[PDB]
Scaffold this active site. Structure first.
Site, short mmCIF file in Angstrom:
data_model
loop_
_atom_site.label_atom_id
_atom_site.label_comp_id
_atom_site.label_asym_id
_atom_site.label_seq_id
_atom_site.Cartn_x
_atom_site.Cartn_y
_atom_site.Cartn_z
N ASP A 1 0.85 -1.19 0.00
CA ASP A 1 0.00 0.00 0.00
C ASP A 1 0.88 1.24 0.00
OD1 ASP A 1 -1.92 1.91 0.27
OD2 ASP A 1 -2.42 1.44 2.37
N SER B 1 -0.68 15.56 -12.06
CA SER B 1 -0.92 15.21 -13.45
C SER B 1 -1.19 16.46 -14.27
CB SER B 1 -2.13 14.28 -13.53
OG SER B 1 -2.50 14.01 -14.87
#
Length: 330
Positions: free
Chosen positions: A35, A199
């Site tokens: 994770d 992004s």
């Protein structure tokens, strides 16, 4: 040193991925959920409330000659999906794919919430976010990667998750045969303890690319792709009959649909998520309403590049003094 381990989807939907991890002496192998959005290595154990164990493999520290109670240390964690666990702490030897860390904090669960009990395939979590998020008190503990970093050939790990298929986590090296083209690196902020990046935009299907900054986290422990409501609405508007259902808890779409791809930007590069990766199947057994793999982050407080996005790429988690993330097509 290096390590290399195969990671395997837990079910036919790629709801999560499990990677075998050797703990203790002799080794006890548990299948852990790696994770990158948390920083605790915790396991089902001989100390876990018996009614909360339902098929998991447990770590028994009393059978490990290298286990030592970390005196006074406790831990307690709550995840974005509302699940939680807590317990005490041992140090022990932990190996992943041939890479060994001695003295790793292994957090032994005394209690786990129902979603963990109900998932017999996940024996615990191995956190790979920054150690500043580790929950052990009163002495915060380091992640497996943090402990291994100095010994690694290069201070990196990579995630290569498969679509409906096994993939690989590597530590200490970049497998240049595992991706196409070049790796595009992008800046990371560690201020929230996550692999947080921006992004450069998105496209839906064959549509034109929209240049817009989207701050979010690379999180292998989250199944889906969670993005701003504007972006998600633009995506689902291209699917006839798709709608956001408050009763189901997100966007659903007719199971008869063919989904468009979704592209996200990494600097000037582009990662394309095929439409099929966005299908999470019937909302309930036999339903013709299917659950979408792109959902709104509006209720979360952060955008999350979960498995839906990351499995479309070869992802480099670069733990150099100034961390960065790399993405390549594959």
């Amino acid at each position: 040193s290096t390590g290399s381990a195969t990671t395997t989807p837990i079910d036919s939907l790629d709801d999560a991925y499990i990677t075998p991890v050797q703990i203790g002496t002799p080794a006890q192998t548990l299948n852990l959920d790696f994770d990158t959005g948390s920083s605790d290595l915790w396991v089902f154990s001989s100390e876990t409330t018996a009614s909360e164990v339902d098929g998991q493999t447990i770590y028994t520290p009393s059978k490990s000659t290298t286990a030592k109670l970390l005196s006074g240390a406790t831990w307690s964690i709550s995840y974005g999906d509302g699940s939680s666990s807590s317990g005490d702490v041992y140090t022990d030897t932990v190996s992943v794919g041939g890479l060994t860390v001695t003295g790793q904090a292994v957090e032994s669960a005394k209690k786990v919430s129902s979603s963990f009990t109900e998932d017999s395939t996940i024996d615990g979590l191995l956190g790979l976010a920054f150690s500043t998020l580790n929950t052990v008190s009163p002495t915060q503990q380091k992640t497996f990667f943090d402990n291994a970093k100095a010994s690694l050939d290069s201070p990196v790990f990579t995630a290569d998750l498969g679509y409906h298929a096994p993939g690989t986590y590597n530590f200490g090296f970049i497998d240049t045969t595992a991706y196409t083209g070049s790796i595009t690196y992008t800046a990371v902020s560690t201020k929230q303890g996550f692999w947080e990046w921006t992004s450069t935009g998105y496209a839906v299907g064959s549509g034109t690319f929209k240049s817009t900054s989207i701050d979010g986290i690379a999180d292998t422990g989250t199944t889906l792709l969670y993005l701003p409501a504007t972006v998600v609405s633009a995506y689902w508007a291209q699917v006839s009959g798709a709608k956001s259902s408050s009763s189901v808890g997100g966007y659903v779409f007719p199971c008869s649909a063919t989904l468009p791809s979704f592209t996200f930007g990494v600097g000037s590069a582009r990662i394309v998520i095929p439409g099929d990766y966005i299908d999470f199947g019937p909302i309930s057994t036999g339903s013709s309403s299917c659950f979408g793999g792109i959902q709104s982050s509006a209720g979360i407080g952060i955008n999350i590049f979960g498995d839906v996005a990351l499995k479309a790429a070869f992802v480099v988690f670069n733990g150099a003094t100034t961390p960065t993330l790399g993405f390549a097509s594959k």
